[PDB]
């Protein structure tokens, strides 16, 4: 029976909430008051990058913490040298409506995707001097929102067709698909061990998938609006989500309940990008008020503003060594902060 | 200079990439972008045929003006999560099927979409080149059935001249930003050949007004 099964699902959800409540003996805010405050964080723009002529929508750091890839709506994908503001490559995309970009851990491949429903992987290193497209991935019936690299041969993708895809680059096929989301998936984050990965959709919920099985282990429903950004903790057992209700939340993977809420009354605009620094103490979140905040992951007190952008901070990322934070904005200006 | 030979050569390569970027950006700025948000089956493909994956790019020129039309109606997803990508488009070409006033009602769906995209926070200053497609079908249909099925407050005459004007006024009553944007309306059909010209004058008027606002004259 349809309604009997719906009632069983409702009872199951109540039981899950009861288990979470029983686990909720204390809270992070009540357990991290005796620790010393992080102190005021003052970061300055070391490198500001010129060369994009339209709204920058995505960025991703390289593993070596020196190279990065910037995606903008002008149709070009500039690979940046952060230490000295040079352009190593400029990639003319087939479609100018790019919305995500990922730098492979090896560095030989960069991937972009957007409203064209295609994840284009570009071979940076080849015996031609070109950055010719290695493979174009098709199969998504919606806009592509996030791209992340497992290795040189596998890339995971989040799209707006209420699904996520794990591709095989060499064959351009759909190895495993992740179904279960009700709204459009906006961003995914990969665990450091790449065994699992999370995904924040528009149904005010973030899930946790087993990449090698395609199954959804865990569901985290904490927000009230769309989830735009997501980022795993450096430890690998937590992940923060940037929602549209101007609140960030730190979930955990072992008690399946929200641990901490990053909210302030003076902020009423949603979060475009969230990424922890090294050691996971600082939560750098970019907002729609031309601003980027720095939060303490263990104390509600804000660390410090990171203003300096003339438009919305579309995306931001922290280096692998944590030395610098690069933030992309809709004003055609990359800025790197230390 | 504290720079190596390879560092200097890489700087030169970066400058060359910058020059290519500037050239491509100037070429793109010489062009015009036209977002095409039709109300589904409301004669969207007819106008595309008259001017000559997920998002379809249509490129055409007229009096040495490189236009770019973006048919995004095939996305079939949430419009709020990518409609900001087109923010800054020169003009939205809205297609409404006049004969769709008998199909709730299809014309009411078109009106709802027009209200949603005209009053969006991104297209406040982005004008709308509205198209009222299938005027021949409207002229044929208005005699068999009246407009009272679609518009209950309508009380005017029955001829096409007044009914089409009433529909245009109803569509043009939806813009709350009557000052910062202007709705260009045209009654097209399958046999018209001047639609691309009308698009040209509407776009050039939009660009002229944008330049005048940017130059301080307004």
């Amino acid at each position, epitope marked *: 029976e349809l309604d009997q099964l719906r009632q069983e699902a409702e009872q199951l959800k109540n039981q899950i909430r009861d288990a979470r409540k029983a686990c909720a003996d204390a809270t992070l805010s009540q357990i991290t008051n005796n620790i010393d405050p992080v102190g005021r964080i003052q970061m300055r723009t070391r490198r500001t990058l010129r060369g994009h002529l339209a709204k920058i929508y995505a960025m991703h750091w390289g593993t070596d913490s*020196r*190279l990065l890839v910037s995606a903008s709506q002008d149709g070009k994908l500039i690979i940046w*040298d952060s230490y000295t503001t*040079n352009k*190593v*490559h400029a990639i003319p995309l087939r479609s100018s409506w790019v919305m995500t970009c990922a730098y492979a851990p090896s*560095g030989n491949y960069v991937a972009c995707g957007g409203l064209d429903n295609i994840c284009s992987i570009y071979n940076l290193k080849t*015996r*031609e*001097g*070109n950055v010719r497209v290695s493979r174009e991935l098709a199969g998504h019936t919606g806009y592509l929102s996030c791209c992340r690299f497992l290795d040189d041969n596998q890339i995971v993708t989040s799209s707006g067709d209420t699904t996520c895809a794990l591709w095989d680059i060499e064959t351009g096929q759909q190895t495993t698909t992740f179904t279960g989301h009700t709204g459009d998936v906006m961003s995914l984050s990969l665990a450091p061990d790449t065994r699992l990965f999370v995904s924040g959709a528009c149904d005010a919920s973030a899930k946790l998938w087993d990449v090698r099985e395609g199954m959804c282990r865990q569901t985290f429903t904490g927000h009230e609006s769309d989830i735009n950004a997501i980022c795993f903790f450096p430890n690998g057992n937590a992940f923060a989500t940037g929602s549209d209700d101007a609140t960030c939340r730190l979930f955990d993977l072992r008690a399946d309940q929200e641990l901490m809420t990053y909210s302030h009354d003076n902020i009423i605009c949603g979060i475009t990008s969230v990424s922890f620094s090294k050691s996971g103490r600082l939560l750098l979140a970019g907002y729609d008020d031309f601003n980027c905040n720095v939060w303490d992951a263990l104390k509600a007190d804000r660390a410090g503003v990171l203003a300096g952008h003339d438009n919305r901070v579309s995306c931001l990322g922290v280096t692998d060594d944590g030395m610098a934070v690069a933030t992309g904005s809709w004003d055609s200006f990359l800025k790197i902060w230390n | 200079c*504290t720079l*190596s*030979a*390879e*560092d200097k*050569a*890489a700087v*030169e*390569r970066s*400058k*060359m990439i910058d020059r290519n970027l500037r050239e491509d950006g100037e070429k793109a700025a010489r062009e015009v972008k036209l977002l095409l948000l039709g109300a589904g089956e409301s004669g969207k493909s007819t106008i595309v045929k008259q001017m000559k994956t997920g998002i379809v790019e249509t490129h055409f020129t007229f009096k040495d003006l490189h236009f770019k039309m973006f048919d995004v109606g095939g996305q079939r997803s949430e419009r709020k999560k990518w409609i900001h990508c087109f923010e800054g488009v020169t003009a939205i070409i809205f297609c409404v099927a006049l004969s769709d006033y008998d199909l709730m009602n299809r014309m009411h769906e078109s009106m709802k979409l027009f209200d949603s995209i005209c009053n969006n926070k991104w297209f406040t200053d982005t004008s709308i080149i509205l198209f009222l497609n299938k005027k021949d079908l409207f002229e044929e249909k208005i005699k068999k059935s009246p407009l009272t099925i679609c518009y209950p407050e309508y009380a005017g005459s029955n001829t096409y001249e007044e009914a089409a004007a009433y529909i245009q006024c109803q569509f043009e009553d939806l813009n709350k930003r009557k000052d910062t944007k202007e709705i260009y309306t045209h009654f097209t059909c399958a046999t018209d050949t001047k639609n691309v010209q009308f698009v040209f004058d509407a776009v050039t008027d939009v660009i002229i007004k944008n330049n005048l606002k940017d130059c301080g004259l307004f």
Partner: single-chain antibody
Amino acid sequence: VQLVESGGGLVQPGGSRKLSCSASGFAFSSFGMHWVRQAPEKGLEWVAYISSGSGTIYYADTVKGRFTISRDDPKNTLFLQMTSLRSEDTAMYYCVRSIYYYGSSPFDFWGQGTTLTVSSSDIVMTQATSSVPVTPGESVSISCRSSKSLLHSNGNTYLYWFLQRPGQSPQLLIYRMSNLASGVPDRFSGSGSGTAFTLTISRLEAEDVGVYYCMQHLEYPLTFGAGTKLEL
């Protein structure tokens, strides 16, 4: 990817010549081309360098003002106009493919070369080992010493190793301090102290026989080293 070259001949001294290097198989415009000589019994010597877009053109002190290098990007060819050909310009001119960005591999591919036989303050690198023998399957460490330290302020040591098999064009092995080039077996390894450098190879076969040239790219002119031959 290939760089075939035309030119050469029996030029009476003082005449003129125009060597050409037609490139096919890669983005020629994005690569800064080079020219390298080789006397019949001597080592390599740099000639000229034209960058991407011909922005900067460099010449060696032995050919400056006398030689003229230029490229035709649409035609995918490289020109080296020569005048007043001395009898000391008799060499095997090589067309060298080089690109310049972070993590790039300059001097990737070398051309076949032309046999031009005219009738009749830089960092000097010394290779002490003129010629050493080897037992096939052992390990050798070719060591060459520079004049001034090649370790720049950016942490990059600009030392390049080139292998020239008998009767063949030079091939890049290690394009910096411990940076193996593409298509090179992992047995080739190199490491230096900033002024004195070595190139160590673990196991040797008939592929390794040849002459190894160590070159510096810190500043122009691009001084090479003498020949270091490995004999079975």
